[PDB]
Design a protein around this ligand. Structure first.
Ligand code: HEA
Ligand code: HEA
Ligand SMILES: CCCCCCCCCCO[C@@H]1O[C@H](CO)[C@@H](O[C@H]2O[C@H](CO)[C@@H](O)[C@H](O)[C@H]2O)[C@H](O)[C@H]1O
Ligand SMILES: CCCCCCCCCCO[C@@H]1O[C@H](CO)[C@@H](O[C@H]2O[C@H](CO)[C@@H](O)[C@H](O)[C@H]2O)[C@H](O)[C@H]1O
Ligand SMILES: CCCCCCCCCCO[C@@H]1O[C@H](CO)[C@@H](O[C@H]2O[C@H](CO)[C@@H](O)[C@H](O)[C@H]2O)[C@H](O)[C@H]1O
Ligand SMILES: CCCCCCCCCCO[C@@H]1O[C@H](CO)[C@@H](O[C@H]2O[C@H](CO)[C@@H](O)[C@H](O)[C@H]2O)[C@H](O)[C@H]1O
Ligand SMILES: CCCCCCCCCCO[C@@H]1O[C@H](CO)[C@@H](O[C@H]2O[C@H](CO)[C@@H](O)[C@H](O)[C@H]2O)[C@H](O)[C@H]1O
Ligand SMILES: CCCCCCCCCCO[C@@H]1O[C@H](CO)[C@@H](O[C@H]2O[C@H](CO)[C@@H](O)[C@H](O)[C@H]2O)[C@H](O)[C@H]1O
Ligand SMILES: CCCCCCCCCCCCC
Ligand SMILES: CCCCCCCCCCCCC
Ligand SMILES: CCCCCCCCCCCCC
Ligand SMILES: CCCCCCCCCCCCC
Ligand SMILES: CCCCCCCCCCCCC
Ligand SMILES: CCCCCCCCCCCCC
Ligand SMILES: CCCC[C@@H](O)[C@@H](O)CO
Ligand SMILES: [Ca+2]
Ligand SMILES: [Cu+2]
Ligand SMILES: [Cu+2]
Ligand SMILES: [Cu+]
Ligand SMILES: [Mg+2]
Ligand SMILES: [O-]
Lengths: 535, 256
């Protein structure tokens, strides 16, 4: 019934975030399949202007079947709309809601022995703002937009003057969507911080809080500084568009580059907001399946704090080719490099935790180990890109696309799958079938690497970001990348099958702790699922 | 002229270098690539070893250690050393790249939706440069018999489609070219991979880059800041030629 949606219990809200995150994730992944269909071969075959003359539904179905080039007038606006849609959904309405809204809301109170969040009614409202934001984001795709068509073709970061001059009101709906998301995140961070500080169990000292709870706490602070800044940036876009301001318009004495500083001031912290909870989950999973306590607990907490702090003083590595002086470029380059150090501490600590353990290669552990490998691959290309001299070549190419898909889609997402398999028994009372989880893992591992590794080659060869079509020479690695995406998509549909199976007819969970003694935090002390009212 | 600055089928490396800056980029990237491949191979081999050596079937009782001070010192300091080493070779390269020398040739480039305008202020030459196959040349941004014909007529082949423009920026070999870049409407970005240059074209700002081309030939770039519907369809053609061929091209533009 609609008694799930009106619930104020952190567990129910956690579950709502997870499911909704998953559904929006499916929609955004479906966009990438369409994107990789068009990128699979040079020449435009799918995104034809001719499909506009049909209806919405008829036009949709026609666009899924390839046309000959001679019958296909390239529609760049549709490409730019899908890309912007893919990016907005992921960065605002998918991964953070799942990790922070989902696992954060469900498990952080359990890990600290809190009965519920400080402000349960505020927690429920944070969910509905997320849903309202999502709805506006989706609606913007069907609203009058740029070039006399539907949707905003402006990139997930909304650079002016392009975002300010895009016609129709699709862009305004997108800006409202982002406001709602920021509001949802801010309320969530308020709750996480208050709960964490005030509602710990007697005896639960700061140095006794589990790492996941710490990851969520640090994350919550980043949100409080980052998200208000973003609300400023985007309100300024909204006023330039509607209320005669000219913050970013040179005719009125504005500067488009100012928007970039403000936006990236949110924009870097944003990626550390995505990844910190995944760092939390990896810590719990690895310790459990290595049957060994987490190595260097205190350096981990501090490395997370250090990463959180440094994430606020590096933003202009997104602006090396935007007109930054040599002094700014040198600074931001050196400040960005420092981040490798605490991150290295965490990678090596995770390896040290495994070292001398008794390793059980169950599904959650496979995601966690994939995370270590793939996050390292993404992280070191991040270090390449920090070198302004080399970023001169790589900026706005597919090399950057490869970096961020390794840290996010093969990093944060592996964190999400790690947590789902780790915790689904605890949350539902039902267990996933082990052979299916491993199959899911290997399909995703192979598919995701096939998708993104070849994008390094495309970037090195000079393929720009945000292109509907590309010179013939880029054909080989685009084709491979697209086959990788189709395989990854297959693994995701299989995953959804695994979840559906697990929840409807999965083996009954009977134990409080169905893993082992080294899953040693409070949730494993409770029933599966935990009682409606805990602690 | 030889087509040099272009992507090649199945390529996995950089585009050929034709400037000393591009050369520096290749070396620095090659140096960092060795390091980061060593780091990730190391990390990967550790994980695979630990999973093999400490599998539950082979190591039935787990250890309990959570510290190893000498190791934590080594693994904090060694990354710091690695980064400082990279920083030492990288900062000179950055300085050379961004310190604008005295120009032999000055070109002012303006980005528009969706084409580039070039002006040579010393020569009182200006012209616009459109993709072969754009609406300007009679097409609609796709390959066709007509577009292939125009590519041939202009000295290219169908393989240069999306790269070749109707007019090129021509410059003399072994001379310092300073390019002043701006945007007319939205932000664009002007780049030539073979020269190791890229500079955003921001409305209201005039920014500079330099290159010195070390061999003659044809070199392509593509707009590198999303700028609307035909972002994919406003490339850059630079022809590097001899001093005499350059003067010849200048005289062809002179109004008597
Ligand atoms: C999960 C999200 C996430 C994370 C965690 C990161 C992590 C990092 N990012 Fe990435 N990044 C993105 C998501 C993310 N990024 C996105 C979305 C963009 C593009 C936005 C857009 O334009 O749309 C981007 C773009 C981006 C750029 C701009 C490139 C360009 O547009 O031209 C830069 C530049 O410096 C950069 C750097 C880094 C660095 C140095 C790290 C560091 O945090 C990585 C540190 C990790 C390691 C280094 C590996 C582990 C360490 C060791 C094993 C120790 C040994 C290693 C060394 C000694 C090097 N990133
Ligand atoms: C979390 C962030 C995230 C994720 C997961 C993905 C996933 C994918 N992305 Fe995404 N991508 C972005 C963030 C992300 N992307 C951003 C920010 C941009 C920039 C947009 C812009 O330019 O403005 C971009 C741009 C971008 C491009 C370049 C577009 C261009 O420049 O024109 C391409 C090209 O192939 C691409 C492809 C893919 C593919 C094939 C996948 C996937 O199909 C890979 C396979 C992964 C899966 C099958 C699993 C997905 C799982 C989840 C999403 C979790 C769901 C939640 C639960 C289950 C609880 N993306
Ligand atoms: C007192 C009498 C006044 C006499 C002087 C008249 C001044 C002309 C107005 C200039 O505004 C123009 O409006 C066009 C129409 O909107 C734009 O075309 C744009 O819009 C068209 C959409 O119809 C597209 O076809 C074009 O590609 C696109 O450039 C064009 O850029 C813009 O400069
Ligand atoms: C695609 C996203 C993946 C989501 C995976 C998480 C699944 C968690 C489902 C939890 O649902 C539980 O179901 C129980 C009855 O079975 C209820 O009693 C319990 O209150 C509820 O919480
Ligand atoms: C489960 C994954 C589902 C993913 C769906 C993948 C659909 C594949 C479409 C392939 O169609 C090809 O498209 C090319 C133009 O690019 C044509 O040239 C080619 O003749 C045609 O065969
Ligand atoms: C830069 C990349 C590095 C990747 C990290 C992976 C390598 C981890 C190696 C861990 O080293 C172990 O540390 C233990 C603790 O320091 C030592 O135990 C020693 O100290 C223990 C602590 O009291 C005693 O219980 C033991 O008996 C005694 O052998 C043990 O010998 C040593 O092998
Ligand atoms: O520190 C900075 O490091 C730069 C790089 O190490 C020096 O650039 C110096 O060295 C560069 C190449 O080594 C040259 O391009 C510069 O002209 C020259 O100022 C620069 O002075 C110095 O303050
Ligand atoms: C004394 C009074 C003087 C009166 C002024 C004379 C009016 C002359 C009209 C010029 O308008 C041009 O129209 C083009 C065709 O519509 C536009 O191309 C635009 O639209 C094309 C078609 O979509 C694109 O391919 C181009 O890249 C894009 O720039 C172009 O920008 C715009 O300047
Ligand atoms: C208008 C065509 C969009 C098709 C998207 C498929 C997902
Ligand atoms: C002769 C043309 C080959 C036909 C291939 C069409 C494949 C389209 C599959 C669409 C699947 C939608 C996800
Ligand atoms: C030339 C190496 C092939 C790489 C394929 C992606 C893994
Ligand atoms: C070219 C056809 C490739 C389609 C593969 C679908 C999986
Ligand atoms: C650790 C990830 C590095 C990804 C870059 C791959 C580059 C390989 C290309 C080699 C150059 C061929 C000439
Ligand atoms: C003179 C060498 C400077 C190198 C600085 C590197 C900073 C990385 C931390
Ligand atoms: C090579 C001939 C140069 C001609 C020169 O006198 C004029 O372009 C001056 O504008
Ligand atoms: Ca295509
Ligand atoms: Cu960043
Ligand atoms: Cu562009
Ligand atoms: Cu452009
Ligand atoms: Mg850019
Ligand atoms: O970032």
């Amino acid at each position: 019934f609609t008694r799930w949606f009106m619930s104020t219990n952190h567990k129910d809200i956690g579950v709502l975030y997870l499911f909704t995150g998953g559904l929006v994730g499916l929609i955004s992944v479906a966009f990438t399949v369409y994107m990789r269909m068009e990128l699979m071969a040079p020449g435009v075959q799918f995104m034809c202007a001719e499909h506009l003359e049909s209806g919405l539904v008829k036009g949709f179905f026609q666009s899924l079947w390839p046309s000959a080039v001679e019958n296909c007038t390239p529609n760049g606006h549709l490409w730019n709309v899908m890309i912007t849609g893919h990016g907005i959904l992921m960065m605002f309405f998918v991964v953070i809601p799942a990790l922070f809204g989902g696992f954060g809301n469900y498990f952080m109170p359990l890990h600290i022995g809190a009965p519920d969040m400080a402000f349960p009614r505020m927690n429920n409202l944070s969910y509905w703002l997320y849903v309202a934001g999502t709805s506006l984001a989706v609606a913007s795709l069907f609203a009058p937009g740029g070039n006399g068509q539907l949707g905003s073709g402006i990139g997930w970061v909304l650079y002016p003057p392009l975002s300010t001059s895009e016609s129709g009101y699709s862009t305004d709906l997108a800006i409202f969507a982002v406001h709602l998301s920021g509001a949802s995140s801010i309320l969530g961070a308020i709750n996480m911080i208050t709960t964490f500080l005030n509602m710990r169990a007697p005896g639960m000292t700061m140095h006794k809080v589990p790492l996941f709870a710490w990851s969520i706490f640090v994350t919550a602070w980043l949100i409080l500084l980052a998200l208000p800044v973003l609300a400023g940036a985007i309100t300024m876009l909204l006023t330039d568009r509607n209320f005669g301001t000219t913050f970013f318009q040179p005719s009125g004495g504005g500067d488009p580059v100012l928007y970039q500083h403000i936006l990236w001031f949110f924009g870097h912290p944003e990626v550390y907001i995505i990844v910190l909870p995944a760092f939390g989950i990896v810590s719990h999973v690895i310790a459990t399946f290595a049957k060994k306590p987490i190595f260097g607990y205190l350096p981990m907490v501090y490395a997370m704090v250090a990463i959180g702090v440094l994430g606020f003083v590096v933003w202009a590595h997104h602006m090396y080719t935007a007109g930054l002086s040599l002094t700014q470029q040198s600074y931001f380059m050196m400040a960005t490099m420092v981040i490798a150090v605490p991150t290295g501490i965490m990678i090596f600590s995770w390896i040290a935790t495994m070292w001398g353990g008794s390793i059980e290669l169950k599904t959650p552990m496979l995601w966690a180990l994939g995370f270590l490998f793939l996050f390292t691959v993404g992280g070191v290309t991040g270090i390449v890109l920090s070198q302004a001299s080399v970023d001169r070549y790589y900026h706005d190419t597919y090399y950057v696309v490869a970096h961020f898909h390794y840290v996010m889609s093969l990093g944060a997402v592996f964190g999400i799958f790690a947590g789902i398999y780790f915790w689904i028994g605890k949350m539902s009372g039902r267990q996933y079938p082990e052979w299916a989880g491993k199959l899911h893992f290997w399909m995703m591992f192979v598919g995701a690497n096939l998708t993104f590794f070849p994008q390094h080659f495309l970037g090195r060869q000079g393929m720009p970001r945000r292109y509907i079509d590309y010179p013939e020479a880029f054909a080989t690695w685009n084709f491979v990348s697209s086959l990788g995406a189709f395989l990854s998509f297959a693994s995701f549909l299989f995953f959804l099958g695994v979840i559906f199976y697990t929840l409807t007819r999965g083996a009954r969970v009977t134990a409080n702790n169905y893993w082992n003694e080294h899953a040693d935090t409070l949730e494993w002390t409770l029933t599966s699922p935990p009682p409606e009212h805990t602690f | 002229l030889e087509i040099i600055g272009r992507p090649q089928p199945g390529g996995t490396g950089f585009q050929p270098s034709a400037s000393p800056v591009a050369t520096q980029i290749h070396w620095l990237d090659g140096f960092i690539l060795v390091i980061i491949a060593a780091i990730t191979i190391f990390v990967t081999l550790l994980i695979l070893y630990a999973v093999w050596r400490f599998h539950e079937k082979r190591n039935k009782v787990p250890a309990r250690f959570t510290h190893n001070s000498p190791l934590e010192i080594a693994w904090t300091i060694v990354p710091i050393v690695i980064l400082v080493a990279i920083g030492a070779f990288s900062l000179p390269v950055l300085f050379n790249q961004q310190e604008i020398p005295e120009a032999d040739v000055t070109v002012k480039v303006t980005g528009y939706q969706w084409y580039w305008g070039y002006e040579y202020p010393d020569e009182e030459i200006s012209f616009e440069s459109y993709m072969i196959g754009s609406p300007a040349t009679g097409g609609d941004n796709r390959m066709s018999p007509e577009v292939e014909q125009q590519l041939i007529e202009a000295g290219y082949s169908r393989d240069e489609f999306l790269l070749a423009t109707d007019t090129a920026m021509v410059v003399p070999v072994n001379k310092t070219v300073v390019v002043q870049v701006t945007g007319a409407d939205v932000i664009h970005s002007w780049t030539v991979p073979a020269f190791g240059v890229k500079q955003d074209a921001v409305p209201g700002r005039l920014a500079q880059l330099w290159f010195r081309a070390e061999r003659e030939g044809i070199f392509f770039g593509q707009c590198s800041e999303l700028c609307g519907i035909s972002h994919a369809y406003m490339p850059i053609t630079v022809k590097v030629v001899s001093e005499e061929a350059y003067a010849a091209w200048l005289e062809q533009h002179h109004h008597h």
